[PDB]
Symmetry: C3
Subunit: 483 residues, 3 copies
């Protein structure tokens, strides 16, 4: 007659790693890391991204006339700019603080386009001839739809021109202007006139006054001229005054805007936009998961799991799987017993110790999930060629946190896996010892997990062991004789 102590086994081939041992097969486990994504852009909080098509952010927002599909009021959860977009700043020059403009635009939610200064505002000049072969529309010469290239009437001198606009709404207004710099005095004279020329812009809180910086430069997009483009934000209540006697590229249309309550982004990607929804939308695709880590992309909007470099984060929940060892036959629970007597034989799990282990492991998993429920958020702000130091500072920082979090996740998994599997060993040992202490020398150890009884142990003697009430003196005499 005998009783054994053992633990669950099954057909699982899933492995985990621990601090002491690699490739350890276990009976149950949980993958904390999400590796899958749909390669496309979906709506976030039911709001669609804005696809810039063949236009850059600058082409869109300045109104490059190849970008008419985008013209007007828009709203978006994020922006998708195609890497090979060809329609941007078509008449050559520089946009001042371009990178800060993009950061502004990535924080915006909705825009309403409106005519800020109609052509009629500018008297004694030609407002209908400011076009260039650099900015074509259907083969023809054209120009930015948000800017007005004013020139002199051929017969007449360029009049002093003035315009004013007041922001009487509760929304800020994003607007644009520029200063044109011809390549030589002949062209200056033709378009504006000789002498001192100025472009002046004034607000309660910004002042601007500049002139042509004439110089012959190599042609870009077929032009030897250049424009310095500027942008600004006219705050609620503020008023703008414009004066010029030449070289003004005037604001024409502008944008009343709202700032998002949510983090937005400009993604530079060729991925398709489709009719779908995502809780989590990364730069390289949408993720639908309830896992807490993710190795898809560090750049996203919505609610995403923490990004890490790991390929897997497999957390052991069950036991070492060692069949012949463990008992494939148990099935009821994690730890338990196998008995053999005259009434028969069989397996039966110990409910108490099994549940305690379930409760602890469950709590461990949830605690890890809970404590890992924050994300470091990388951002795709841009930096100019004269901003290498801050660009490098941003990169080292983002890689810095990535390395810390990847380390924290991987190390924790290795260490707690070892603990979890040790806890199981200890739980099994505990049951075996409780049986040991009870039977004393009315049974033989066998160094096996099992005990050979020195007496007959019926189905009530055996259940007397499972509830921990055995009674040694009852079989003491019977046992001592067999020797």
């Amino acid at each position: 007659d005998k009783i054994c102590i053992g633990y669950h086994a099954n057909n699982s081939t899933t492995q985990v790693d621990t601090i002491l041992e690699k490739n350890v097969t276990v009976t149950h486990s949980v993958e904390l890391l999400e590796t899958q994504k749909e390669s496309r852009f979906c709506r976030v909080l039911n709001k669609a991204p804005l696809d810039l098509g063949d236009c850059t952010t600058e082409g869109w927002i300045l109104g490059n006339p190849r970008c008419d599909k985008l013209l007007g009021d828009r709203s978006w959860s994020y922006i998708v700019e195609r890497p090979d977009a060809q329609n941007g700043i078509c008449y050559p020059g520089v946009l001042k603080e371009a990178e800060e403009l993009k950061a502004l635009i990535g924080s915006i939610d909705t825009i309403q386009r409106f005519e800020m200064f109609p052509k009629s505002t500018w008297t004694g000049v030609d407002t209908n001839s400011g076009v260039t072969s650099a900015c074509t529309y259907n083969g023809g010469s054209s120009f930015y739809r948000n800017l007005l290239w004013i020139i002199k009437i051929r017969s007449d001198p360029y009049s002093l021109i003035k315009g004013t606009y007041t922001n009487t709404g509760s929304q800020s207004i994003l607007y644009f202007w520029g200063v044109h710099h011809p390549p030589d005095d002949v062209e200056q004279a033709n378009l504006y006139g000789l002498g001192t020329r100025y472009v002046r812009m004034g607000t309660e809180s910004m002042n601007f006054a500049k002139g042509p910086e004439i110089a012959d430069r190599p042609p870009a997009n077929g032009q030897r001229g250049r424009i310095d483009y500027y942008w600004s934000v006219l705050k609620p209540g503020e008023t703008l005054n414009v004066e010029s006697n030449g070289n003004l590229i005037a604001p024409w249309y502008a944008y009343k805007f709202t700032s998002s309550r949510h983090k937005g982004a400009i993604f530079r990607s060729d991925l398709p936009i489709e009719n779908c929804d995502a809780v989590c939308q990364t730069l390289t695709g949408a993720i639908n998961t309830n896992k807490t880590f993710q190795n898809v992309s560090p750049i996203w909007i919505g609610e995403c799991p923490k990004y890490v470099k790991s390929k897997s984060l497999k957390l052991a929940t069950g036991l070492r799987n060692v069949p012949q060892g463990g008992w494939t036959g148990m099935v009821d629970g994690w730890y338990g017993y196998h008995h053999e007597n005259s009434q028969g034989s069989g397996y039966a799990a110990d409910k108490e110790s099994t549940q305690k282990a379930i409760d602890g492991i469950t709590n461990k998993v949830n605690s890890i999930i809970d404590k890992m429920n924050t994300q470091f958020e990388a951002v795709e702000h841009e930096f100019s060629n004269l901003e290498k130091r801050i660009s490098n500072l941003n990169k080292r920082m983002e890689d810095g946190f990535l390395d810390v979090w990847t380390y924290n996740a991987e190390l924790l998994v290795l260490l707690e896996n070892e603990r979890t599997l040790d806890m199981h060993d200890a739980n099994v040992k505990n049951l075996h010892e409780k049986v040991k202490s009870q039977l004393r020398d009315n049974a033989k150890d066998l160094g096996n997990g099992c005990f050979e009884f020195w007496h007959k142990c019926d189905n009530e003697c055996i259940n007397s062991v499972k509830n921990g009430t055995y009674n040694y003196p009852k079989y003491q005499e019977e046992s001592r004789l067999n020797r």
Copy 2:
């Protein structure tokens, strides 16, 4: 006759969490997190903060004439600027590199105000008419006390004016100037004259040259004109030359200054300043604590504990409290209860109790030691055209806060489990040392206790507690009882 093994219990209702289970009552514990603060500003290393009252940093340092309460030499451990302060830049315009000025000012310790360029410096011009209704003093038109608004004499043209000052001391000098921009050419002509006009400032190591940017703008504080305000630092030994033919807002008074040996700050707060001292002074109050973490504020000066988001960080030191345990023990953590003809009673095991005390004390101190650094957030400001670096600073500050909060919270959960396990193992060790000695001269009982198969006197029992029992002495007597 019997001997038992047990562990301490008490009346404690303090709970801790562990990785495996929550709300576990324990006998002793230590809160690592400080949550309390006095809602005020105190002295730090015995130096008081400077209260700017109804002035902004800029109103103060430019010498807005409503800020005379601050005028002159001052010294401070930190600066307190009130959120509603009304006296700042009164004549409209921008201070260039305003945010970098503030960072500088937060790093300064003491200033001494002095006349850098007296009015007599500027010949052939009017130095006594440069006042405005935008900057009022006692119902009158006035102007910044540290700047001089020079205009042309009506009858005469604005002479080329020159002035020079040499820093012959060992302290750097913080000084200010500006360029005035009238709204139109009429005003430009009246005050300065037409033609190209410049303001040029030169040092051994910096040059500045700028002109009027004339533009008709909406009024601000009743003025259509603007000033671009500038600041700079004249180093020891250096000389400043000033040259202008118009539009100059000249430095008048300036500040010799010392840089602090300590970290300083500008706090934007309404909290009161009081007669008190603080080792640790945060933006939302003073902390007096020997704890190593703190959830009050990430911004401070002095020596403060590490900031974390946690509401609590309770580290178990004692045992699971299950009164099970013996409320009767009291002497120590682990021990014995005996019963014989001479009587009964509890007595702690000194050796194993002290070893546990030493380990737990060492663990606490080790954690304290390794957590004795702080990440320091700063309240530097960023302009509207510095959103990228501002966001970079924010993500970084939140980034370290999240790593430290994680490290602290997880460590507490994990070590709480280990600490309570260690206690279990220690109790079992004692019980086994007794088992091994008595063999079959006592019965286990599966109880923690042992029923002796013989009589065990107060010397037999103390023979167990020191680990020298002698089995053969009672071997016969024990085997007879069956």
Copy 3:
């Protein structure tokens, strides 16, 4: 007749710390921290550093004529600038975006110097008199070799001058120019002429247009004038046009360059450059190590271990050294000592010893693996008006240093405790496997050892070591002894 269970000891005096106790002597250990370096600068990936000697980066790259040792084509893995270097910007003035130039230069690996605009490009002007006593060569007045200081011929007016250059190669070109600002109108007229004067530079992607900002400034290096120096990069395909009627300091020679595929650096150090190679080269010396941590310097190029503040990171691999343990074992970590009629001796248990070796080895390697990443501090410079970003870079660098130092030091304390506990458990397991087998045909002794109640030959003893003993064979012979 007896059998004992014990563990290895030796003469080791090496100590480690754990979370529960300090200064614990152990039998084997490994130091994870590298503290040694060679105090010199070596080649990295086969390429030598460039030693700037008595020149600053700027003196070199502008071609200060006292820097002819450096003149022409050069290549380097990193740059070494000496702290007391004197030959820099000799004619006083400011280099615009100087700090960003240095970052660029640190990222470059080869340059080829070439004449971009020969003197003949500028007609109707004096190209052979642009020298100053501020920039001496062999006692004589001279000038930067990469710039050309053009002045008017005395008899003639300064002609409009033009030049153009097109980059027809695949490499970018780094070039320089400047605008001269004389101290007064007399000198302006003498050198260039009166009236409006301009310096215009144009590319497909950049435009520049500026004039003299005339002002009398204190003399620096004997000069009241100044030059604003500029730099830029002409990309492959681009063409540069230059137009001026005065005040132009023209590019003369420039540098075609390649960008390194590897991180480079400018080290400010007096350490000697020698004939050696380093995998890892830090600012304070070369490191050759296989260790994973390092407390030498946070600034480096090449492949270096992670920087931390620690003085030591000693990881226990072996046992607590208590000679207790058996100095006599030597064969392994855990094992047996037997005594019978055939003799006596020690013998390690191979199975349990190997399992422990495998786990500890795996632990060490896992730690090494997970610590195989480095945060890299950089020595970019920041101007006086960049205190905020400079402080941001510093707090960030110190932030990660503190996190990694903590992670390393805490991990070592915690795993040391686990490692030493694992050994205790392994020994106990063996002792119990022998207890269970012999039952009461041996006496425990409470000692680690077992006195056999019978004769146990060299086959009886090996019958214990493989776990197959057979109690009934000797059971009777036991019960006799009573």
